[PDB]
């Protein structure tokens, strides 16, 4: 596996100049200051970057680079994206099930997993929970070892890291670079950038590249990496770090005069002499079923924002049941009976912000797993919102309805239960999908100010219970069609107020000089301005379903049109 | 200025062992691994740490350390706490006005400021806005120079840094350590820790301490810092970093056998021979007036969460005015007239979360400025909540009331305006102080879930407008006394529904077999269950004032009982 590249003048203003070199099958490194091309040449050498502004020729083993390159390579990204709620073995089982083909068997796949575990030396922590400095089960070094082990299951013939030392102890950094030299002895070429190395980890490198501010300063083996600058008139001082001295040369202790010495060097010509000789998946159900399993296990790992929602739903169910237990077929009736229906509708207004972060907390993981070819965007999307839907959208409406009707008995049908439970599910899931679509990239004040403004306007003002909607002039009355709880309130009124008279032998209908001698619900739905046909019960459900589809399409398009490079 | 210390066995489990040394007036450094006492001995040498578990003797110039030590020293903390919305000169003017005494003059103080500016070399950025990688006006190095310059106005005879290199470019790090050696030539002793130094910045150090895992490994000058380990049998390898080699010795390439070589060394005895010879504000109005000025200028620097609140308040004022413009003295009256009063009361429900972060975003700055003796806790508290109160609590109620009554005319008094404006101010400031007290240390889901649960329960359920409160049994009706908008709703009903009959020549009072032949507000307040005396208007204001005082006392005690060490 010989990765090669030639004159890659990457421009987005010209962040890389003309650059060429050959990545021999060893422990190739890329050094330099942070603002240079140390992290950009690595993304150019992987895909990891907009291929439009390349203007170069990256080439593997003589042939140019395929589009099927991120599926056969491996990019261990810098910030550890590994799941800090799963164990090591069920991180690697996940990556095995989504990177290895389904044609092979679970027996062979688990042999591959424990082969990688015994290779990387993870066996004493092969069932502890990985941590992210959130819940402590592993070290930092074994966490980095898991991030390396995930991109080894596919057996990559060419492996990319991205600063595999930063944020670590020097003992763990020396141990992980010794791990890379151990795993590099199978011919597996390893290419990485490093921030501020030391002379301990410098004999490890088979070849060495060095970029500064977009220019190439050196590309050759480390045994004459010092000899180049010792040929250019500089002197390595006594007991001085050479890798740090490479930076002390290029910080001014100009760079246009320092770059050209490599242009007229000997390794420029020897590199170009070989370089011109070189130049002349998985089924959808499987990805859905594994993403949903991973998110279920993550939700069991962090059940703190979910049992909080279950606790508040039980407390709200008990409170609204106790308030509604004091409502009978009496004179103190319909005006508070229409208040408890609004409470039943908007009982899940608090839980809408719990799904504001569903594709935001793991987006550095989503971008990496998508462009490494694990799953599709639609598959990740459906597998994630099939994992928030069951225990955080459908379950609290189940337990809220079974707590409300435990403190009750109003229409014994066992179908008013089902249509109420479906209405609460539709209202809760519609408001939660609105919080997915409308609020994604915002702060801690802005998300809650936004979701309380569209709790003011579209739940208290326009979902008309305390201003009658057929008095507003017809340029502000149209905003009642955008409000979630008006549909749920209408669908619960149409289920509550059908047939019952609420006045046991006290009609008094016909008191014309008086006011409001009307008590039945059939002459209350027309006063509220809502339908009486059975289409008037399901018009609200089809409107909420249209809102769910539109908000989930906005939440899907915000995932599809994400800069994944 | 000779800082000295002897046998400081700090324990919180015994994170420091017995430790002694002498900080000569130079450029003393403290090295080692991160988990050792590199950052803990520095906090022990400053105050910066619980003085209970010290068990040692820190001593300056022969005399023991005064309690007036943080006011005369200077601690440049690691994470830059400098304000990223003010300029350099008005950071230093702030620190001058709160650290230099009020007995001297502004003329001399500004001479001190531009003396420090011309000394540290900040003059070409002496009026640019400091940034925090938020709004870019300075570099990182000039930002660190501002953090150094703030703790130089008091003219400290002994200056503490805390890793003044990490997160910087190596050019800026070498320039800032050359700045420390430049400013150290006036006898100003400088004591710092460093994470991973290089041999470029090693000749600078006058003396050098080195801790590892709580034990002292070396304390002496840097010219024999290598000679100690070259006397202990180790060999410094060719072209190898000595400062990194100090870590390569102590990472195992045990430590109980490596520590005792310094115990039987020559510098142990020579240090102990001198060590045993050694051992044998500002007015409250000024601090309030400068903290409030700093927070006003910070609010002008980031007017993005405030003009958002002003924009939403104008839009809500226009919407509620347009809905209320369709309400007359007609039959479609009191039931929606009691809905628009609830909208007027809870129009600032969205802005309550905008003050959830007021002492949370700057708490690393507050802890440092308190224990460096800038201000009192009560002074910072009052100066900060006098700066959120005017443009984010009082101003939107002003413009909401002047937008609502611009689209109106209901009781021309110019006193209903004032009592409505005061009621909206009290409700808004009470809900915002509740969001200060109840939610401080929480996440992005938890803050909004909490402030929407106590928007469900204490604003829609129990602030009774859509369930009549005098039907609930008297074990859940008591929760109406904890709700903010019930008081504002009662205080606006008592101002709206006094005297007016709402029925122009259509009384019909006395229709006993019929239902609800009552139209006047005086027989509507008794139906709502609220008072008619003028005490019934101000009982709600004194209850809201009690809530403001209790929630602000909780927000003050959470600032007082904060671990400031």
Author numbering:
A (entry chain A), B (entry chain B): 35 to 46, 61 to 301, 328 to 354, 370 to 654
Quote the study on this structure:
In the apo state, ABCG2 adopted a single predominant conformation that was distinct from that seen previously with the Fab or ligand bound transporter. In the absence of 5D3 fab or bound ligands the TM helices adopt a closed conformation while the NBDs remain separate in a nucleotide-free state. However, the helical rotation of TM5 observed in our apo-closed structure causes the Phe545 sidechain to face the opposite ABCG2 monomer. In the apo-closed conformation the positioning of TM5 results in these sidechains being oriented towards the dimer interface, such that a sulfur cluster of 10 cysteines and methionines along TM5 and TM2 is formed at the central 2-fold axis between ABCG2 monomers.
In total, our results delineate a new paradigm for the conformational transition cycle of ABCG2, and reveal how different chemotherapy compounds distinctively alter the conformational space of the transporter.
